[PDB]
């Protein structure tokens, strides 16, 4: 029997990855292609939400630092105007004992109490002395932390914070994933900074970043998707994949429409993929993979941006005085993330969780905060209380005075939030991925390929892109198999306009 | 003024690199392309010469181990029949103090005299003890050798041999070039072999290889070049580039024909390239690069293959009893490298350089030997005596009895033999290569890009191929910039028939 | 009430230690003194027994190597004649897999099977590599063995042998005791010896030793004791100490005679001493100390000394094919340890445990063998079978052919054989010894002070000597508290004739 | 010919060493003995001088910390009353950049400027990291300093101070002497002190010490000498040894009197001894030794003890703002080192070097300061200026305000001040000392045996004591040959009343 539609390359999911695939496919204009999504709005986890009070909220506050000139070109195409972007300097801090410690924590010990400085420097001297002699490699994340920082920093920040974010102990995670993630503190420099009381907040890929002026990060992907031929796309309930038959290479959607593919590029969660395939081997294989759900909490609060907050972007909270691991001053990114000052809104509550002194709509201005709370089977959260706990933590961390008027509240739980880099991960993936590809299926993405090392927006985009480029031009998928390689360099070869396009354009010219 | 010919991509040189470029170009069938060469026969340094007495000789006995399935595919295309190739197991030895020591030398100490065994194991223990404590990296090749093996093996083999081949001391070469070249010996295994008297000759990329049944390795490249459209090739005095004007992107040939290009893939020696451009900056820059001239000596000798030689493939000679650093029993590769048994040839001389007892044409059978002798400004040779010294060395190494009858003598001096991995090399290349590419000039190859690490046949072929793939598809030149990356893996992504070709073929089917 | 006898210094036990005490006391001739013993013959554990068939047997074959010129002087006084001593070269071997491996075992790996040479050298390389980096110190004997030699030599010899002698696992013993006992293998020298098949049997304090011509080693202490005033000695049942009252400083003998002292030098087993004091604190403290019983076996066998034995002195047996840890060819020391050639003796049995072919008294000559078998609560023995098992071991080790005729059989069990250097030892001794000295009691000797490091004959002699010299001249007991100090030097200061004696003589001369 | 006097043991020199010899000889009461000295007052370098204004001064402010219970006993005998001694807690500082840094300097980095704190901690980190890997031993004192501390502390304190005291560079001195002298800083504790701003002034043999109430330290040795039989002594011009004949064992004094000896204990400078013997070999050998002359400066100053001085005992001065390496607030030791308050004295000068405002004799109270200034051929001093320069340095170091009234001035040069522990020292001594003892001569003392390690008062006393105890009782001279052994322990064995004395007494009681 013949399928309703038949393409050479079928792309499932219109998130950054699938949009990357579609962008490269459309750039080449070679094989016939088609992209579907169960969501009427493209963007996936990189989309933006809006509260009834006019407050924008990303999925955990995203930031663009690209290793890819291609990604750069696509973004410059989607939003070409100068005033489409705001450029921001990275201002990051860590909350440790009533202090704001300049990121990276391990490099700013000088801003700690003396008693803790002692412990940290001690552990550092220990770890350094042993590292001078070591020959083996760290087995676990925890081991890597101890070797690179010391027990002082490990117990004061690393262990509790990393459990607070990853929802698993650092002893159950691997250590191959932190090439450009976790900085390795140098003893001499650290102690020098402890003596001189100076700082060093230059380390990190996020040195200087940019953010879309309007519509949040989702606007970027809507704008990108708008560069694609509308007829080659299928977003909404009409594009929801419900079945995948790999034996005869056909995908069945929600409405019943069947598509035939020669090559499949799937960016949905790989466990969902196996579940769709009805391949018990692959289901059982994927069920060895571990992830953590993400709770995104939004708070819109009345008043000018406090002096206490300043130009802070995002902050880490390793302590237990709050349920969230990271907060973001969203209002600092773009004035269009929150309502204008002339907008009148009623006070929902005070930061202490009591009635307002007035239930009338007052003017602004406003500012916005976005918190993230992790969940797993090792770290459950209570949904009905999590908002109140988040606000209460905002009080306890001196983010909000108990007199501060809360204008809006947001809360959304994402089942698949983080692809946990456990010890069993590669053991599962090196089986799952090659077996999918032998059925001509390229499963890529934050949950398609499950590798956090390369699970950022640009990374995903180029996962889709390189998947397609592999399928067509036999290119090697560097982004997928060599995270250190791609993250360690400036990828300037692949562009939105290639020699193929140029030469063909000059070919049809005559 | 207009050029006589205009192409999008112009390829200079029909060696393995240029032919790689041409192969990928012709595969994609995108932009207009043209390949030229000053030689009527394609193959470059990978070609085959023949003596008037019917003996075949490569340029140093070229042996194939491919890291590239693309290279594999092109070869399988050029010579498709089963009987086009002969399969051989690697048999390699090192001549050390009247002994044949199985490659790798550093792992077969057991075949040495006891005193030297002691020296070697001593040096190895020292080096192993220091390595347990080392935190820095070796500055020079010499340092790398001492750290990895010890002064015993260093003085007994590594230093004198490496001078004998590289024509420069090991203290003037870098060490970043020897990933899969030099084997790092393990103390425990080495000593265990010294105890048991066993051998370990499985290390090396050459474990098993194949050789073209006829026409030497040059026949391979003729066969490859024959798969190209004849009209898009220009081989001979008509294809000799004498001028390169990068400012207006035009090349002028010997006959006067001018060819305009948009992109230039040049495989000629980079210093010759600068000389052709008349770019004094690039001339002065390239003249900082170092190379060694190579003498190829051939000796056809009467008689069946001696028991003493056996099924040996190639042999290394670190000592000073001979001027050559390597010999190759070329007759072992294919029975068509030398005349048939029934062929009658007069004896030229005995192995001791004396007159034969009979100058009449006698029957065979025959066997063949091919030597290589380095030359530089640090290691000058005398051409008028080098043949006699090579034969005399063949006697001194007990390769030939002084009674053996020499039937044929070959001798050729290639001015650009080896691109020397000096300390200043990268210092020059990181200037030269980017400046050329800014003039849209991809200078690739053994002397186009000057990197021995990746200067083999497959390596060169893929230098051209990936240069083109970069120009057209924006792929990254992994073979050029990341020799360890390409050498340490199995490159299976890029094939002679890609998804582009397949999908286009299915599109022209309807 | 008054004591029957009153002396300034009382010496209990006429073993080497007590004899040392008595010798220094008698040299000084200062304070009044007296020495008692329960045995009519002085010598203690360094005495000789005789079988009814005329075979002499020490207590485990004793060998004299002196660290003390004083000990030397006393010996030269007791036996001054040239023919009172026989000089011998140390010929020692280890029985491992049908092989006689030259002592020290860990330095003569070359005389082992290849398969075991490999293991041993592997372990040595590992151990050397870790030792290059180590900064701590070994906790136990076992750890010391592993760090210094490797798991190869450890499992092949050190562990099984050291259990076979110490009657405790090497993990329960300390490592501070082996300064001049166990040799530390040098990797380079060892491997060089494995290469050249050479030997290294020069290590050890026992380089060239002497042995008393007549009466075994006991004759030395009889001869020494015969330089003491008979009236100041009390050997026999009359001299058996059965009570010690430290409060009023009185000693009650067997017959009831009471001896009052100002200072007490006790050489009996310290636990026995506590039991004699009826001091429960000291009994409890001493019961924490650990010792092993020693079984001494003797075999007189008919025939000339075989070629298979040669000039071997003592041999170690790490394997389990025999119950004994060491054997000694006693007949090699002196021709008087065994009956003369003309002596006629009946054959008791054959070496395989069967009746002789002839029960008549036949001529010789003869040779003698002495075996030692350890016993503890971790290594129980069966006395009724131990002799037969020892002979069987002599068969299994190719010491005795089953045809050999056994002329005499000796067996004696010494309850206190070895002062086991357990981990708890110093923990006990550093309490026991100072608490005894506060009661003016110097407990010295192999079981008086319980330190194997310094439990040799000369060591003991000088333990008594230095104890007295401390009591009289306030000399520091270096032999007791600094075993490494006294063992690592040539003690030439203290002589049998000192300046005091000289000047006193020259004073009485006028 | 017969000598006018004949003794068994002759003791030259009535310093602490010779007095030790005399004390032990007189204790034993064995051989005949005699002690001579060219000085009518016993004490040697440990004597006290007095200025005409009634100010006492030792030879560099001597402080007693005893390793010897024997030394303790002799002192308790000489000055038995409780009020004969004053007890003081050690208060020591280092003058570095207008600061008082608590001893030891290397452990109190916290009290330094930040810029120098950084340098010091850096050097410490480097040195620690290298030390984790080091497998050799330091060759020179300088090397030891760098290894144990770092280039920071080395350049800031160690090098300049140690030159300022030893009068030779730290590169010319050996490192085998500093066991209990120089502290080895622990990086962790040091950095902890730097963080917390804490201190650590507990390290050092001089934790709590005592001082003779009257007559300085010389009073001690006079009091000791007064416990000897006067007839066996010979102090002054009569006891001046001018000639020594070793071949016939006789000594010729100043008056011509000859004394025959069987054993000689010389405590005079060994070079002077060789000069006295006219042994050219020994002179040539002794002149290979190196010493440094010591200048002692005294300043009596009017006024109550300033708050600026406090209860400071002695202070080190590494900088070049003064010529002296050490100062001692001698007035803090005893109120009897300086005149009583009611004493009336004129003012010699103001501390800035001008006339006083009043040349009339006013009252006190007073206080005293004693400086030490080294001299050699590498560090020459000017005698005529050295006093004024010392006072000027007292001004520059803010010890004396320029208004301070100087009451008295002392200045004495000691040709043999310090036995410099050079690299050639042991090379000379291991020849000189044994060759003297072969002529029955025991050269002991600060310049008799020339070893600073053990050149303190108690050390010297016990050098004589142990020399004699070796001559008589064959005791080992641990103090001479094993400085680490004696300094690292509590020597409690040898007492002023020994078992010989007790037993002999009790024997003469009956």
Curated annotation (Swiss-Prot), chains A, B, C, D:
Designated name of the protein: UDP-galactopyranose mutase
Residues that, per the record, bind UDP-alpha-D-galactose: 60-61, 103, 106, 158, 161-162, 166, 181, 206, 316, 326, 418, 452, 456
Principal EC category: isomerase
Domain remark in the UniProt entry: Contains a flexible loop (loop III) above the si-face of the isoalloxazine ring that changes position depending on the redox state of the flavin cofactor.
Provenance organism: Aspergillus fumigatus (Neosartorya fumigata)
Reported impact of residue 106 to A: Lowers the catalytic efficiency
Binding of NADPH, residues: 67, 90, 92, 103, 202, 314, 316, 418, 446, 456, 459
Function description: UDP-galactopyranose mutase, key flavoenzyme of galactofuranose metabolism that catalyzes the 6-to-5 ring contraction of UDP-galactopyranose to UDP-galactofuranose, the donor used by various galacto-furanosyltransferases. Controls the biosynthesis of galactomannan and galactofuranose containing glycoconjugates. The flavin functions as nucleophile, forming a flavin-sugar adduct that facilitates galactose-ring opening and contraction.
Cofactor note text: Binds 1 FAD per subunit.
Swiss-Prot/TrEMBL keywords: Cell wall biogenesis/degradation, FAD, Flavoprotein, Isomerase, NAD, NADP, Nucleotide-binding
Annotated binding of FAD, by residue: 17, 37, 45, 60, 62, 241, 326, 446, 455-457, 460
GO MF: nucleotide binding; UDP-galactopyranose mutase activity
Phenotype of the disrupted gene, per the record: Exhibits a marked growth defect, reduced cell wall thickness, and leads to the absence of short beta-1,5-linked galactofuranose in the galactomannan and glycoproteins of this mutant. Strongly diminishes conidiationa and increases susceptibility to drugs such as voriconazole and nikkomycin Z. Displays attenuated virulence in a murine model of invasive aspergillosis.
Known outcome of mutating residue 65 to A: Lowers the catalytic efficiency
UniProt feature coiled coil, ranges: none
InterPro entries: FAD/NAD-bd_sf (IPR036188)
UniProt-reported outcome of changing residue 206 to A: Lowers the catalytic efficiency
Annotated EC: 5.4.99.9
Keyword Isomerase: yes
Family per record: Belongs to the UDP-galactopyranose/dTDP-fucopyranose mutase family.
Keyword Nucleotide-binding: yes
Pfam family, one: NAD_binding_8
